[PDB]
Amino acid sequence: GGPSVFLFPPKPKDTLMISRTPEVTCVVVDVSHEDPEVKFNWYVDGVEVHNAKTKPREEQYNSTYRVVSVLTVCHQDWLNGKEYKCKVSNKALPAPIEKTISKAKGQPREPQVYTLPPSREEMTKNQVSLTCLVKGFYPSDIAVEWESNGQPENNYKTTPPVLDSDGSFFLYSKLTVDKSRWQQGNVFSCSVMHEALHNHYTQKSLDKSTGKPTLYNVSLIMSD
Amino acid sequence: GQPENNYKTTPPVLDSDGSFFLYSKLTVDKSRWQQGNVFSCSVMHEALHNHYTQKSLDKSTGKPTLYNVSLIMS
Amino acid sequence: GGPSVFLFPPKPKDTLMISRTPEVTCVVVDVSHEDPEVKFNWYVDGVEVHNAKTKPREEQYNSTYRVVSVLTVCHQDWLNGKEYKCKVSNKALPAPIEKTISKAKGQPREPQVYTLPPSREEMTKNQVSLTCLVKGFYPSDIAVEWESNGQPENNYKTTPPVLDSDGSFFLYSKLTVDKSRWQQGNVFSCSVMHEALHNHYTQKSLDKSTGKPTLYNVSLI
Amino acid sequence: GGPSVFLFPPKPKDTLMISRTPEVTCVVVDVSHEDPEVKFNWYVDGVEVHNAKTKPREEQYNSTYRVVSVLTVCHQDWLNGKEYKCKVSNKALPAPIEKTISKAKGQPREPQVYTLPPSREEMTKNQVSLTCLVKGFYPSDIAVEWESNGQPENNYKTTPPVLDSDGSFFLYSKLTVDKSRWQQGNVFSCSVMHEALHNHYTQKSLDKSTGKPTLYNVSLI
């Protein structure tokens, strides 16, 4: 019956990328088809904004409508942590419902990033996997991306953040590639972007060498 | 000696093929780690033999090759 | 001949920084005392904008009135390359002077950033020098910063770049450290910020054990 | 048409080199059409010496004539720092224009020159960059050359001097070499000549992975 508004907080990668800073999404489902009018209101820091954007409603089979609306606001305004408010009003709802969305409040912590070279047992498999773990970041806003200078990697795996005992978060990023590419000393890195990180960018490149005491296995030459 | 409790397992996630994969992390002290203590992760799955498979670590990863670089004098 | 109006280009650091939005400043110098207030007009692609601001007049050592006006432009707008116009009207000035600036146009090519480890005698002296160079950028809008284990310390050398034989500009950056800092092996980050780089910001890490090729290294000529 | 005078400091390499004859040039531009000839007077050590090198006048679309007066001085006279006086008189100018040139000899500091091993990543690029650091000099007149195997290098880049916290300027010398030349073990020498330098020459030899001790050292990886 009554439409229900779902809260979709901005993805921190959206805030970081230049092209998609202003986008803020309000989504409403279970909208009654009897009432065609939809009222949308944005409250930023307690005041109403003049400009608004709303896409046409989407028809659903089960007598429901989907309403997606986009609000434009500076990314630095969202980074300030001020509360944002979304209001959706319709004739079906006896009273308007106000929803508040804001970034999680907490003490920022500098995350730690570590890369792991593949185990010896994995060269039996055709595809070799590389892992980059990040840990010790209290906010849930994190962006980990695999990067190579020669060419960006199509494959990209990331597990959802897992709560830690101390209250921070940790996760892993996985990249599967071919054996030949890894053996040829290809440059790989896991760019990590966090609100607490300085410059909002940290690069930890992984080298081919595993640090074994003997890897050359070639007799050296002395020249005076 | 005995099983531990300071271990966290990530929820399973999808892959390109479709088969799931996940990680598990255990936090320990460096004093016991540097002493050469075995640490084993046991996985129970239906497809595994006897529904049990243990993988152990003896901090012996990256063992140097038997061959060594020859030293000469000029 | 009366007040002079200029439009200073935005600083390179603010232009390429997502957090610090670029700022466009317009300056009026030698303003007549009898006419301190000057009418300001700011146009973005021929459109009036209400976000322009001007700072209060500040006295100069030469007893000449100087006026500055700042406008906050969109970070994406500078990437696009929009046109901004500043117009200053003064009663003393017979004809207003308008200054026009535009974003540099050129082929975006990814610069290469290299790090030079100190030699085997650089630690003999009291100060050890760490150098990071950037080559192969056509636009002059680039930023280079130094980072030491999360402690911001930059010498702001900002040595002027010089064109190469192929026309690809290059620049160098130098930092001075102590013997203990170099011998510790802590990571030192040369951070480069340019249009052509991925995500507009990249870093290069240099350590004491920055790298040793598998091939033998000769100790004598 | 508003005649102008410009000051051109002399090249230090002319004075430092015994074979090269030092020359001091004073140049006048924006000479009006009605008076192409400019009355030029030259004084050294407050006295008149009979030598002059006046360039012939040339026609330009802006009706501006450039006149250069060149004076010959000895190495000892140049090292003294005595003022050289150029006086220019024109019909259009109500009064003669005076200019003087004299470099300041203050706090002569012997420059320190260092060479760094090539960066690891440079082996991937088909061009290898060689860097020569020089610092510890107060004056801005420094001579730099790249003398490889006894013959000067065709291409070399010199960064302009910049300010420093120690009060002495520093700069870099960049050389580009092919990977094949560096693979065979070619040796390049960076020669630095300064007015306060001992015997006006400092140089050293470098190779792949330069090491001051006679030992094979390898860092962590």
Decide if A207 and D221 are in contact by the 8 Å CB cutoff: yes
Rg (CA), chain D: 23
Residues A77 and A134 in one domain: no
Chain C contact for D155 (CB, 8 A cutoff):
yes
Chain D contact for A213 (CB, 8 A cutoff):
no
Residues A151 and A82 in one domain: no
For the record, the structure tokens of A14 come out as 């959206």
Domain membership of residue C33 as a residue range: 4-101
Residues C164 and C194 in one domain: yes
Is D118 contained in some domain? yes
Decide if C191 and A202 are in contact by the 8 Å CB cutoff: no
How far D133 CA sits from the closest chain C CA (Å)? 10
Bridge-partner residues for A162, per DSSP? A170
Distance CA C112, CA D125 (A): 10
Q: Looking at D54, D77, D101, which one is the last position of a domain? A: D101
Residue D118 contacts residue D26 (beta carbons within 8 Å): no
For the record, the structure tokens of C92 come out as 């003393």
Is A136 contained in some domain? yes
Chain D contact for C135 (CB, 8 A cutoff):
yes
Decide if A222 and B6 are in contact by the 8 Å CB cutoff: no
Decide if C21 and A147 are in contact by the 8 Å CB cutoff: no
Residues C93 and C141 in one domain: no
Give the best residue of C123, C192, C202, C219 to mutate against chain D (max D CB count within 10 A): C219
Is A212 contained in some domain? no
Query: Can you say whether the dihedral through the CA atoms of D117, D187, D126, A175 is positive or negative?
Result: negative
Residues C82 and C140 in one domain: no
Residues C92 and C134 in one domain: no
**DSSP conformation class of B12:** P
Distance CA A161, CA D61 (A): 72
Q: In 10 A of CB C218, how many CB atoms?
A: 18
Distance CA B34, CA D150 (A): 57
**Rounded to 5 degrees, what are φ and ψ at A13?**
-60, -35
Residue numbers in B near A210 (CB within 8 A): 62
CA of D43: how far to CAs of A203, D29, D114, in Å? 63, 20, 41
**Number of folded domains in chain D?**
2
Is A223 contained in some domain? no
Q: Looking at C101, C131, C159, which one is the last position of a domain? A: C101
**DSSP conformation class of A120:** G
How far B1 CA sits from the closest chain A CA (Å)? 24
Distance CA D65, CA D56 (A): 9
- Tokens 């973005």 belong to C44
Residues D80 and D146 in one domain: no
Chain C contact for A212 (CB, 8 A cutoff):
no
Distance CA D11, CA D29 (A): 21
Chain A contact for C19 (CB, 8 A cutoff):
yes
Chain D contact for A207 (CB, 8 A cutoff):
yes
Is A152 contained in some domain? yes
For the record, the structure tokens of A220 come out as 């050296």
Is D221 contained in some domain? no
Bridge-partner residues for A65, per DSSP? A59
User: Which three-class secondary structure state does DSSP give residue D50?
Assistant: coil
Chain A contact for B18 (CB, 8 A cutoff):
no
CATH number at residue B48: 2.60.40.10
How far A110 CA sits from the closest chain B CA (Å)? 19
Residues D86 and D119 in one domain: no
Residue numbers in C near A201 (CB within 8 A): 191, 199, 201-203
For the record, the structure tokens of A154 come out as 């199509």
Residue numbers in D near A211 (CB within 8 A): 220-221
CA of D135: how far to CAs of A172, D110, D116, D140, in Å? 47, 9, 14, 11
Chain A contact for D221 (CB, 8 A cutoff):
yes
How far C26 CA sits from the closest chain D CA (Å)? 28
Q: Which of residues 54-113 of C touch D (CB under 8 A)?
A: 112
Taking alpha carbons only, the member of D15, D111, D32 closest to residue D72 is D15
Residues A194 and A164 in one domain: yes
Q: List the chains bordering chain B where 3 or more Cβ pairs fall under 8 Å.
A: A
Amino acid at A24: V
Distance CA D145, CA D132 (A): 10
Distance CA A26, CA D57 (A): 76
Decide if A212 and B23 are in contact by the 8 Å CB cutoff: no
Residues C36 and C93 in one domain: yes
- Is residue D157 exposed (0-12), middle (13-18) or buried (19+ Cβ within 10 Å)? middle
Residues A58 and A124 in one domain: no
Bridge-partner residues for D102, per DSSP? none
**DSSP conformation class of A198:** G
Is D218 contained in some domain? no
**Rounded to 5 degrees, what are φ and ψ at B58?**
-120, 30
Q: Is C155 left (phi over 0), alpha (psi -120 to 50) or beta?
A: alpha
CA of B19: how far to CAs of A162, B13, B15, B53, in Å? 21, 9, 6, 18
Q: Looking at A47, A81, A101, which one is the last position of a domain? A: A101
Q: How many residues does chain B have?
A: 74
Taking alpha carbons only, the member of A86, A79, A73 closest to residue A39 is A86
Is A222 contained in some domain? no
Please report the number of interchain residue pairs, chain C to chain D, with beta-carbon separation below 8 angstroms.
Answer: 101
Distance CA B46, CA B26 (A): 24
**Cβ partners under 8 Å of residue A120, min gap 6:** B61
**DSSP conformation class of A123:** G
Decide if B10 and A217 are in contact by the 8 Å CB cutoff: no
Decide if A76 and C202 are in contact by the 8 Å CB cutoff: no
Buried b vs exposed e over A54-81: b needs ≥16 C-beta within 10 Å? Answer: eeeeeeeeeeebebebebebebeebbee
Q: How many residues does chain C have?
A: 221
Distance CA D27, CA C165 (A): 29
Residues A52 and A13 in one domain: yes
User: Which three-class secondary structure state does DSSP give residue D172?
Assistant: strand
Nearest CB to C147; choose among A198, A200, A209: A198
How far A40 CA sits from the closest chain C CA (Å)? 26
User: Which three-class secondary structure state does DSSP give residue D207?
Assistant: coil
Q: Is B16 left (phi over 0), alpha (psi -120 to 50) or beta?
A: alpha
